Amino acid sequence: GGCLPHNRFCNALSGPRCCSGLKCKELSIWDSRCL
Numbered sequence: 001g002g003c004l005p006h007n008r009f010c011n012a013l014s015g016p017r018c019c020s021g022l023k024c025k026e027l028s029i030w031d032s033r034c035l
Contacts, residue, residue, distance in 0.1 A: 005018075
């Protein structure tokens with residue numbers, strides 16, 4: 001709801017971001033998740 005929960009699919013481009021403690025890690029060219 002507010003931030004992106006850890007391990008949740010985050011959108012480095014369009015969409016909310018993870019809060020403190022989590023970060024949107026890129027898994028590939030078009031794959032990113034809070035990590």
